[PDB]
Design a binder for this molecule. Structure first.
Ligand SMILES: [Cl-]
Ligand SMILES: [Cl-]
Ligand SMILES: [Cl-]
Ligand SMILES: [Cl-]
Ligand SMILES: [Cl-]
Length: 941
């Protein structure tokens, strides 16, 4: 636990070792040790940082001065202090006697020699020098040989890591030589830190105004570049004066990059700033992200680290290549580590106070230096009371009238051109050179990231491998879908088909479509990979924000698997059932009645594929239309093949539990009524929980309408399956967060006959009723929701944020605090977040087990995706893993954890006892046999 002022002082010294500003660091170390009140601020890690630096230069006397400085403050030399001293003796080649005397002092204390190379983290150049100094005492080096990495032995993950040769790992469709090329293309992209893309917006020929807007733009950009460069120079000298005065300053941090590359970066931030604006705090974080990211790239580029990674990656590709064969079947993370992974030393990101202080300076420097005639380009506006930076409205229109034919993106904001780097730790994986965190959430990030590093070694393997697997799925653009989206986009849009039209929030959706479509057009003839991330509760997301499989129906329709799989005997039926599912028609029908409807409607399926805009347009009336069209097209190709069973299908087919969370509540509470309602119990027809819930909402609605309640009165006939499903989602998963509830407002807006004046009032009323309904009808939901809410309320009232561990060993922490825990958010969020972690656990177990069976598996929100050829195998694994997850004592273990973590409080002894009382009163499960799930057709459909 280090102060904010102490964190920055150490980061200052750490930074000086990179910038070759060791006298600057030493001066600050001397000054602070000179002031009796400031000596207390000096940690042993600080003196060592200054000692390490001197050792690297070979400045013995300056290092020896720091040793004497350690003693004078009342401190003891650790292993690190002895590593610097030895590195300094190693570099300058010292006499046997002088080295032996230092070695005699070491064992006398006593510190172990063999423990120095193993425990202490030191660079390759550092270790070899420290080794050569010990070698002057002529050993007998006898350094322990490579210890084999341990495997995860947990009940749930045991079979994933077990060396029992019952494995058939999937290779990529591409050969080693092809995959090696793609890695270079990606490395080239990452080294430039920016990707340039042709704009898909129809370029009008340079008119008298377009030429003039572009001319005015060039002069401003030329003006700003010189203006910023001077502002940076002036602040660097000002902050340098502060260091010479013995005070911390962000000076060394501004010396990591070339002045011209900081200015370029600030200019491209100005350029990428949305017309609607961005929050100042987010911009500060974005500038520090871009400064660090580029710094780490430059460091690796000069350290010779790129070539080492080039060699490592090319050896790694053998496991993924179609033409190559690995000695023994292996997992990507396991193979990457086994080769001899050079742990990316430059890991160390700057602490949050350094990250924010730097970001603020860069943001306020960009604001002050940039001006334009009609004066400054950016303005500070305060909104939900959060500080935002909005650009000049004339400048935004100046960019519009310019119509720049080129779009530029940060390399890290676009898909990867080669398979991603496997996740080996919370701080390593995904992008080739750029740093990516395993957990994405900003609120309380330091607290969670620490928890993930505090982990037992093998504990995160399940989550690490699943995320590696998600990232390893090769994608490609559905060209026919893209071509049609571009015809509509390039011609005033089509809002009916979710294609944004040109110009309130018109610009945000249109530009988001413009960036996405321009990337899809750029990648149209390429294979690409989406490395994946996790939020605090374990929800998976692709790292690149602009182009992903995520978003809308149109975004989902633009993608298909790069590698295809022959349909086999059942693929075609699965394609047809999938098409029917996407229509939103046939939800209450069994699988065979859905398959029958596809045959009945086959002419419309073909007419949709053959002339989507000019025929009968049957696809347009689908719940998910673009995905229905993409499916009509695939069905058409398969039926027209030489043999439909041998047709190589690329279209992903989806399966979900309807409301995955209610399935967890039913299994956690072994609730037979709940279990039947969400397809845990086998049945010949799917069960609709929303039907039961809608009826329950109706009886309550009738009463409030029988009374004075206008909201209830106005909702008569508007308690639809779609409205209720969205409310069920909101109640099950919403933290508040108006997310799910704004989607409820959307579904009411889609109901033309509903008074659009009541939309906001009704969404709150529907949430209230659905919550009351779910408790009334299901025991599992009722008791578990109430127990989790109460436990969280008590944990928070004692002054702690709720934290747990998933059944897969992933630590979870709710970050909601007040600008001190946010009691309301901690208690309301615990049931949804706990449920999110169980969805994560289940998906991770399904992914990991499917991989062993050689399947391509992806998770897109509530849904599991595979090739039509492998649906039944995915479903089988899905059911098996749910039964396995829930067969573990989830609630009892969570209770056990929470008691051990939150009930040892000697300042709040009564509250701790009262909390232990609630925690140990774990809801008692019902009679439901969990084994039934393996026989349930509608469990996932
Ligand atoms: Cl290219
Ligand atoms: Cl490139
Ligand atoms: Cl470059
Ligand atoms: Cl293929
Ligand atoms: Cl049947």
């Amino acid at each position: 636990q280090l102060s904010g002022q102490q964190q920055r002082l150490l980061a200052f010294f750490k930074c000086c070792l990179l910038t070759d500003q060791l006298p600057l660091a030493h001066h600050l170390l001397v000054v602070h040790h000179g002031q009796r009140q400031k000596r207390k601020l000096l940690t042993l890690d600080m003196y060592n940082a200054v000692m390490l630096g001197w050792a690297r230069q070979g400045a013995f006397k300056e290092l020896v001065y720091v040793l004497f400085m350690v003693k004078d403050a009342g401190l003891t030399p650790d292993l690190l202090s002895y590593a610097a001293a030895l590195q300094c003796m190693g570099r300058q080649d010292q006499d046997a006697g002088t080295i032996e005397r230092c070695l005699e002092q070491m064992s006398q204390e006593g510190l172990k020699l063999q423990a120095l190379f193993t425990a202490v983290l030191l660079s390759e150049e550092d270790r070899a020098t420290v080794l050569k100094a010990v070698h002057k005492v002529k050993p007998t080096f006898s350094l322990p040989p490579q210890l084999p990495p341990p495997v995860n032995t947990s009940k749930l993950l045991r079979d994933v890591y077990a060396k029992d040769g019952r494995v058939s790992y999937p290779k990529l469709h591409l050969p080693l030589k092809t995959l090696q090329c793609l890695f270079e293309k990606q490395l080239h992209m990452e080294l430039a830190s920016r990707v340039c893309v042709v704009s898909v917006e129809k370029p009008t020929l340079p008119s008298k105004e377009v030429k003039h807007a572009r001319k005015t733009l060039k002069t401003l950009r030329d003006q700003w570049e010189k203006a910023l460069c001077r502002a940076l120079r002036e602040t660097k000298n000002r902050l340098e004066r502060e260091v010479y005065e013995g005070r911390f300053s962000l000076y060394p941090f501004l010396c990591l990059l070339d002045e011209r590359e900081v200015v370029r970066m600030l200019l491209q931030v100005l350029q990428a700033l949305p017309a609607q604006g961005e929050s100042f705090t987010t911009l500060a974080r974005e500038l520090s992200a871009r400064t660090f990211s580029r710094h780490v790239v430059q460091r690796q580029r000069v350290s010779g680290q790129v070539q080492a990674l080039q060699n490592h990656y090319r050896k790694y590709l053998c496991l993924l290549a179609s033409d190559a064969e690995v000695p023994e079947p292996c997992l990507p993370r396991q193979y990457w580590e086994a080769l001899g992974a050079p742990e990316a030393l430059r890991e160390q990101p700057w602490p949050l106070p350094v990250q924010m202080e730097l970001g603020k300076l860069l943001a306020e420097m960009l604001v002050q230096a940039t001006q334009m005639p009609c004066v400054p380009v950016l303005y500070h506006v305060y909104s939900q009371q959060i500080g935002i930076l909005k650009p000049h409205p004339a400048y935004v229109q100046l960019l519009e009238k310019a119509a720049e034919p080129t779009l530029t993106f940060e390399a890290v904001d676009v898909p990867m051109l080669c398979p991603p780097l496997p996740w080996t730790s919370p701080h390593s994986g995904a992008f080739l050179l750029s740093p990516t965190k395993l957990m994405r959430t900003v609120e309380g990030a330091t607290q969670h990231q620490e928890l993930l590093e505090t982990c037992p070694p093998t504990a995160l393997h399940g989550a690490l491998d699943a995320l590696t697997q998600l990232g390893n799925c090769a994608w490609r653009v559905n060209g026919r879908v893209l071509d049609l989206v571009l015809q509509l986009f390039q011609a005033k849009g089509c809002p009916q088909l979710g294609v944004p039209a040109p110009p309130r929030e018109m610009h945000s959706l249109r530009a988001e479509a413009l960036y996405r479509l321009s990337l899809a057009q750029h990648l149209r003839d390429r294979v690409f990979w989406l490395p994946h991330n996790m939020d605090f509760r374990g929800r998976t997301y692709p790292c690149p924000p602009h182009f992903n499989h995520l978003g809308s129906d149109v975004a989902r329709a633009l993608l298909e698997f790069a590698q295809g799989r022959p349909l086999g005997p059942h693929g075609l039926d699965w394609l047809k059932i999938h098409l029917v599912n996407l229509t939103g028609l046939k939800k209450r029908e069994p699988l065979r009645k859905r398959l029958a409807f596809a045959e009945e409607v086959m002419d419309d399926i073909l007419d949709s594929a053959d002339q989507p805009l000019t025929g009968r347009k049957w696809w347009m009336g689908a719940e998910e239309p673009w995905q229905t069209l993409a499916c009509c097209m695939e069905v058409a190709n398969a039926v027209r093949a030489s043999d439909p069973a041998a047709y190589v299908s690329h279209l992903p087919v989806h399966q979900d539990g309807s409301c995955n969370g209610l399935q967890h509540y039913a299994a956690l509470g072994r609730d037979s009524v709940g279990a039947a309602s969400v397809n845990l119990e086998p049945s010949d027809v799917p069960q609709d929980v929303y039907s039961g819930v809608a009826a329950q909402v109706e009886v309550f609605r009738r009463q409030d309408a029988q009374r004075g309640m206008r909201v209830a009165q106005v909702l008569e006939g508007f308690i639809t399956r779609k409205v209720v499903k969205q409310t069920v989602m909101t109640v099950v998963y919403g933290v508040t967060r108006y997310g799910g509830r704004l989607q409820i407002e959307k579904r009411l807006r889609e109901l033309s006959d509903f008074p659009q004046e009541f939309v906001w009032e009704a969404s709150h009323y529907l949430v209230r009723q659905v919550f009351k309904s779910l408790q009334e009808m299901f025991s599992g939901t009722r008791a578990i929701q109430h127990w989790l809410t109460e436990s969280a309320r008590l944990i928070s009232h004692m002054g702690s944020v709720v934290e747990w561990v998933t059944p897969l060993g992933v630590p979870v922490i709710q970050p909601y605090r007040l600008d001190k825990p946010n009691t309301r958010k901690q208690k309301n969020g615990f049931p949804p977040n706990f449920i999110h972690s169980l969805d994560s656990s289940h998906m991770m177990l399904t992914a990991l087990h499917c991989y062993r069976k050689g399947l391509t598996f992806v998770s897109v929100h509530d849904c599991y995706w595979t090739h039509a050829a492998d649906v039944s195998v995915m479903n089988q694994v899905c059911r098996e893993q749910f039964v396995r997850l829930h067969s573990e004592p989830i609630l009892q273990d969570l209770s056990r954890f929470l008691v051990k973590r939150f009930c040892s409080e000697p300042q709040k002894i009564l509250e701790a006892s009262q909390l232990k009382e609630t925690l140990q009163a774990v809801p008692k499960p019902g009679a439901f046999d969990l084994e039934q799930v393996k026989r349930s057709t509608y469990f996932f459909s």
